[PDB]
Design a binder for this molecule. Structure first.
Ligand SMILES: Nc1nc(=O)c2c([nH]1)NC[C@@H](CNc1ccc(C(=O)N[C@@H](CCC(=O)O)C(=O)O)cc1)N2C=O
Ligand SMILES: Nc1ncnc2c1ncn2[C@@H]1O[C@H](COP(=O)(O)CP(=O)(O)OP(=O)(O)O)[C@@H](O)[C@H]1O
Ligand SMILES: *P(=O)(=O)O[C]C([C])([C])[C]([O])C(=O)[N][C][C]C(=O)[N][C][C][N]C(=O)[C]([N][C]=O)[C]([C])[C]
Ligand SMILES: CC(C)[C@H](N)C(=O)O
Ligand SMILES: [Mg+2]
Length: 1181
């Protein structure tokens, strides 16, 4: 009876509730926009029911309707008041449920009417939880509404407590809506602050150690040594003098000495006096020494007579070999330091810009030392090497960690540092048990037969070798100078493709963030941020740069450091290093980390060291150069063949540079900036002309006469491009001929023997293509169907202007006649008309991440093929993103058209000008129709007549009972082939004259065979370009053609043999692909009858890598439709394969399809490793 005002996020929210209320003969007025106290909308309103309402109701509205305002909140109040209640119930691990409550003045604080608990399974994604809760609260309302209107329910006040969250409280977690409950909590453990500080300075701890082990050896240099007591006394003597010369807390004192007893005395003396030491290696270039002394505020300098002159008399010199530099007093100084005072300043390499002084405090170093000693179980019996230059923090590790453990430091002889055979002898002679070595030196030392080491720590660069002649444990540590030596540590227990850098040290946490500084899910790559007790004070005399790299996170408020390193968390907690963010480069349509090639090339027997770099040429294109250290230069073809075993062509360096040894740097890393630069051929006239075409199609500088097309990065798309370019020389080439003559040499002989698309004039009406007719006929049978609608979405940031998007789309309508085309019936002829302008249906909406799928499904509606434009668009704006969507009819937007539609939209959004389109779809339609009357068409159609005349193999799939009629209810599952496996698949195909499509098609056909008790033949469908004329490569319209592939599988033969046979049947099919599908059914004597599709129930489609980034961010949305029993679409994304399993829901449930996917994966893994294995040995289980 009463009139109900319904308030919601959008008009569509809580449709079940609105439907139940109306069934009871309530009048339901829906309002999603803000309501005011004095409003017309509160006219004859008896009840206000709000449900995800985005505005607060004024104090006047609540008092006027007191007792009549009901709200549906999907949380167990008082927990999780305000926005995103379901998300916070999971993240803050609160009681879970849903609540119907009265509305009062404040947010979610009114007395409760009904409350119910709810449980989210560990495997449910947050989107599942959002929907599961909403579903629960809506049902609860429908059950208790009767009790609510009649006022039977006794309201009970809320308990004090609970959390009120706001819109911006979620910003940090915006990327986590697709994770599971188990995954989300897992991320919380790693990336969240806990709920004992450091209260000591290093020399406090050192002095403590001396009283415990006074007579233990502390430092050894060749034959001379000092005990902990002796070292302590002498350092105190120098420290009394230094503090007498004015050294105050935070004061910098330069030290310029060679590794020696004097160096360790000098370091400790500067700490005891109260200052921080600035190490200046005397072997540095004079330019750098002067820079370090000048940029540093150090007034005092400790040095020798030897290196005295290198200071240019700039500082007050204190000679460590002058007796008057040492006081008589041997006692420890009165302590004047605090753990937050500087302990040392070290400078970054002056390569990438200028050298910066890194300021490290006492508590930074103490934290590392106290972690290190128990982590490695360092005892007073251990002996450590002082190997690193004392200008790098690898030295701080050598000296400070082991001095607080009572161990003995061993100055490495200069003459034995670079001679690892000699160093190994010194270590075996003196019993050296643990030390740190930079990665470069570490990898070389692994060849030495060592018996003394117990632990070897390495770091600084990517570890690429672990095989070693020694019984010692190998550790991989990672960290920037800006965070004290190391922040993560990993024990190398077994081989890895990418040796992890491990887990954080004490009082340290690592975060993986995106560019917006928001958390990444576990297993997703982002920028590595460091938090905790390791972060130094900042950069000396560069406070702007310090605030830029030592950021205070805008949401968490914690101080973190931007490392610039790309990294990723593994499921086991270990971190994985993925290179520098700057080293990502696009090579011929693929975004790659060149460092991922090095382990493959290094595995070569004659190659010891490798580094691959990206270099630019005049064109602006990038190319790869693989440098290697080998005894002798290895021929280019041998290295290309070696890598071709595992990598596609685009990941094989175009040039290889041999070198005796790589130029290192003082820290001990390979010097990337110092690597040198780069220093049968066609002889015939036609051969040169062909090489120029190949070099442009494949994006390659020089093409060999015998180079195989597929070996050098060729695929079917570029096969078509090749035929296009050749006709720009008057040379006609057929698709099948490119695969029977895949080299320039074989193509020469074929072309020694042997028409633009003419735009049509203005006409009232134009012919249609064969494919356009079919689409129009299908749509006319079920007039309001949507099985042939195409829907995409693009997640845009909130900064993107909603108007520019709309304007870009409306510009595309003017540009492409297809967007201004309509289809009408003229007698018994389907005919096309073109309008000069057409209004674009564009919609703006505000929704929620949980609701986007629902909001969008409402927009998807049938098209009137006679009304233009045949495309709609809209933007659904959620809290953290703007979701652009557009729904088009398939008669206009095929697969390649989507790539074009994406390329231009990205350019229009980037403020770039597009030259007008040359040709129109009209002209191709007429050209193709008139071509049907030629001899070549009669040839093609004859191939299918003879192929499909005999008995056809009927593939049976393992389905539930088939519906009696053709059904189209569908769902989707997705299987991801990681980059490593995809890289192997592509290499295998090219190595054996196969495209990736050909290989995947064979795995699929075998898969269908195994499910048919190992049948000899299988029949499946596929899709082809349809771009018959070369001048249609940039047009919008439907060209794709559907082809039946009749394949044979010989289970007695090898996988390789079947690949070749499938290739043999595919090429003739593609040779005659330009026959309309309706004519192929007519030629096979088959009609669309029964509950099975004409020729095949399984469809296999494939799409190459995206041409542009905007296309990568396009996501094809499925509105629960399956045109066939089962469709497999392989899409190349993120250097991997996303294989979509679109399936009929009446034939499969989620269970069956998930087991079929697992079987398919298992079959794929066997097939890629089992090239010569007989196909019958492959098993699904
Ligand atoms: N008086 C009242 N009590 C309620 O419990 C209640 C309402 N009104 N109206 C609807 C809904 C609460 N919905 C919302 C939606 C958005 C914000 C909002 O704008 N939050 C801002 C900060 C709010 C402020 O400015 O103080 C934010 O940034 O999150 C608040 C409440 N609700 C029961 O479900
Ligand atoms: N165990 C490890 N594995 C892989 N890379 C590592 C690593 N340890 C360090 N690195 C790399 O080397 C960086 C740390 O080196 P640092 O000693 O801090 C000076 P740098 O950054 O190499 O050059 P710079 O002197 O111009 O600052 C890291 O940011 C990372 O890129
Ligand atoms: P070659 O590498 O051996 O490739 C052989 C092919 C696959 C036959 C090649 O010649 C080819 O034609 N590739 C393009 C085929 C194609 O268009 N795949 C995607 C088709 N998908 C759609 O049309 C969808 N609409 C928009 O995307 C829809 C029908 C699902
Ligand atoms: C120990 C230290 C030298 C660390 N490996 C670094 O990369 O700086
Ligand atoms: Mg650096």
């Amino acid at each position: 009876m009463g009139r109900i005002l319904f308030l919601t996020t959008f008009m569509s929210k809580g449709n079940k509730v609105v439907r139940y209320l109306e069934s009871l003969h309530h009048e339901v007025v829906i309002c999603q926009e803000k309501v005011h106290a004095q409003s017309a909308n509160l006219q004859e309103i008896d009840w206000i029911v709000s449900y995800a309402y985005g505005y607060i109701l004024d104090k006047e509205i609540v008092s006027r309707f007191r007792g009549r305002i009901i709200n549906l909140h999907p949380s167990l109040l008082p927990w999780n008041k305000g926005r995103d209640p379901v998300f916070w119930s999971v993240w803050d691990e609160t009681p879970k449920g849903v609540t119907i409550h009265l509305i009062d003045e404040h947010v979610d604080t009114g007395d409760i009417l009904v409350q119910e608990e709810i449980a989210f399974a560990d495997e449910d994604t947050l989107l599942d939880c959002y929907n599961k809760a909403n579903q629960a609260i809506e049902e609860l309302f429908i059950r208790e509404w009767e009790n609510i209107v009649h006022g039977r329910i006794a309201p009970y006040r809320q308990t004090a407590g609970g959390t009120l969250h706001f819109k911006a409280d979620r910003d940090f977690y915006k990327n986590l809506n697709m994770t599971t409950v188990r995954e989300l909590l897992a991320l919380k453990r790693l990336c969240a602050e806990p709920k004992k500080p450091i209260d000591k300075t290093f020399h406090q701890l050192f002095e403590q150690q001396v009283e415990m082990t006074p007579d233990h050896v502390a430092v050894v240099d060749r034959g001379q040594s000092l005990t902990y007591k002796q070292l302590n006394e002498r350092a105190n003597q120098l420290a009394h003098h230094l503090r007498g010369k004015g050294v105050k807390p935070d004061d910098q004192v330069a030290i310029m000495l060679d590794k020696s007893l004097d160096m360790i005395v000098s370091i400790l003396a500067v700490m005891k006096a109260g200052g921080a030491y600035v190490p200046i290696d005397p072997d540095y270039p004079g330019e750098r020494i002067a820079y370090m002394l000048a940029d540093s505020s150090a007034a005092i300098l400790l040095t020798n007579a030897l290196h005295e002159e290198k200071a240019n008399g700039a500082c007050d010199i204190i000679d460590v070999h002058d007796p008057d530099s040492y006081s008589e007093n041997t006692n420890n100084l009165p302590h004047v330091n605090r753990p937050d005072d500087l302990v040392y300043v070290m400078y970054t390499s002056g390569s990438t810009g200028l050298a910066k002084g890194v300021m490290i405090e006492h508590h930074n170093l103490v934290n590392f030392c106290e972690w290190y000693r128990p982590y490695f179980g360092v005892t007073p019996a251990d002996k450590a090497l002082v190997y690193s230059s004392f200008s790098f923090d690898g030295s701080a590790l050598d000296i400070f960690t082991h001095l607080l453990a009572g161990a003995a430091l061993h100055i490495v002889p200069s003459e034995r540092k670079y001679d690892l055979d000699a160093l190994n002898d010194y270590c075996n002679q003196e019993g050296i048990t643990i030390s740190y070595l930079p990665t470069g030196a570490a990898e070389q030392f692994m060849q030495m037969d060592n018996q003394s080491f117990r632990v070897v720590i390495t770091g600084g660069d990517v570890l690429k070798k672990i095989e070693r002649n020694g019984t010692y444990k190998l550790y991989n540590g990672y960290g920037p100078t800006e965070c004290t030596i190391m922040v993560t540590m990993f024990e190398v227990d077994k081989p890895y493709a990418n040796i992890p850098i491990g887990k954080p040290i004490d009082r340290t946490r690592i975060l993986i963030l995106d560019e917006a500084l928001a958390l990444q899910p576990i297993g997703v790559a982002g920028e590595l941020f460091i938090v905790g007790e390791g972060l130094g004070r900042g950069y000396l005399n560069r406070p702007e740069l310090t605030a830029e790299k030592f950021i205070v996170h805008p949401q968490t408020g914690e101080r973190m450091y931007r490392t610039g390193d790309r990294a990723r968390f593994l499921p086991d907690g270990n971190i994985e290093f993925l290179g520098r963010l700057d080293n990502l480069v696009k090579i011929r349509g693929y975004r790659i980390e060149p460092g991922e090639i090095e382990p493959f090339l290094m595995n070569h027997p004659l190659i010891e060291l490798t580094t691959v770099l990206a270099k630019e040429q005049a064109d602006g294109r990038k190319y790869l150069v693989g440098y290697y250290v080998a005894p002798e230069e290895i021929p280019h073809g041998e290295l290309r063949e070696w890598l071709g075993n595992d990598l596609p062509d685009y990941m094989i360096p175009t040039y290889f540079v041999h070198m005796k040894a790589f130029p290192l740097t003082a820290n001990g890393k390979v010097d990337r900036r110092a690597l040198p630069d780069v220093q049968v051929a066609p002889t015939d006239e036609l051969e040169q002309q062909l090489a120029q075409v190949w070099s442009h199609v494949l994006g390659i500088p020089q093409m060999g006469i015998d180079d195989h097309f597929l070996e050098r990065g060729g695929d079917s798309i570029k096969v078509m491009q090749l035929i296009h370019q050749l006709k720009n020389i008057g040379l006609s080439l057929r698709y099948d001929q490119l695969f029977t003559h895949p080299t320039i040499r074989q193509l020469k002989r074929l072309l020694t023997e042997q028409e633009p698309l003419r735009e049509l004039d203005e006409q009232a009406e134009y012919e249609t293509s064969a494919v356009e007719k079919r689409m129009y006929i299908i749509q006319q049978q079920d007039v309001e169907s949507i099985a042939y609608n195409v829907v995409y979405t693009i997640n845009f940031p909130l900064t993107v202007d909603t108007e520019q998007i709309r304007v870009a789309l409306e510009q595309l309508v003017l540009r492409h006649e297809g967007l201004r085309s309509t289809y009408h019936m003229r007698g018994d002829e389907i005919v096309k008309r073109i309008v000069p302008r057409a209004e674009l249906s564009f919609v703006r909406q505000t929704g929620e991440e949980e609701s986007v799928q629902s909001l969008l499904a409402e927009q998807i509606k049938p098209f009137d093929l006679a009304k233009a434009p045949l495309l709609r668009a809209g933007v659904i704006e959620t809290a953290d993103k703007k979701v652009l969507w557009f729904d088009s009819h398939h008669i206009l937007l095929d697969g390649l058209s989507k790539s074009i539609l994406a390329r231009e939209l990205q350019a229009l959004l980037g403020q770039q000008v597009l030259s007008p389109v040359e040709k129109t779809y009209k002209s191709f339609a007429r050209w193709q129709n008139e071509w049907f009357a030629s001899d070549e068409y009669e040839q093609q159609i004859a191939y299918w007549k003879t192929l499909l005349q005999g008995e056809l193999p009927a593939v049976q799939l393992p389905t539930k009972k088939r519906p009696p009629q053709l059904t189209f209810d569908g769902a989707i599952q997705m299987y991801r082939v990681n980059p490593e496996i995809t890289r192997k698949l592509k290499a295998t195909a090219a190595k054996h004259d196969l495209t990736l499509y050909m290989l995947m098609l064979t795995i699929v056909s075998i898969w269908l065979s195994k499910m048919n008790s190992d049948s000899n033949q299988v029949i499946l469908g596929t899709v082809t370009d349809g771009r018959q004329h070369p001048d249609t490569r940039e047009l919008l319209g439907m060209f794709v053609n559907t082809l039946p592939l009749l394949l044979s599988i010989d289970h007695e033969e090898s996988f390789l043999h079947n690949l070749q046979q499938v290739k043999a049947k595919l090429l003739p099919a593609l040779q005659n692909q330009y026959v309309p599908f309706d004519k192929i059914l007519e030629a096979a004597r088959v009609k669309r009858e029964g509950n099975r599709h004409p020729l095949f129930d399984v469809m296999f489609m494939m799409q190459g890598a995206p041409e542009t980034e905007l296309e990568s961010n396009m996501h094809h949305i499925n509105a629960g439709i399956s045109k066939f029993d089962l469709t497999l679409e392989v899409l190349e994304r993120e250097n991997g394969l996303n294989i979509v399993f679109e399936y009929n829901t009446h034939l499969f449930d989620e269970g069956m399809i998930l087991r079929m996917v697992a079987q398919f994966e298992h079959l794929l893994l066997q097939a890629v490793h089992g090239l010569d294995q007989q196909v019958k040995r492959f098993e699904l289980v």
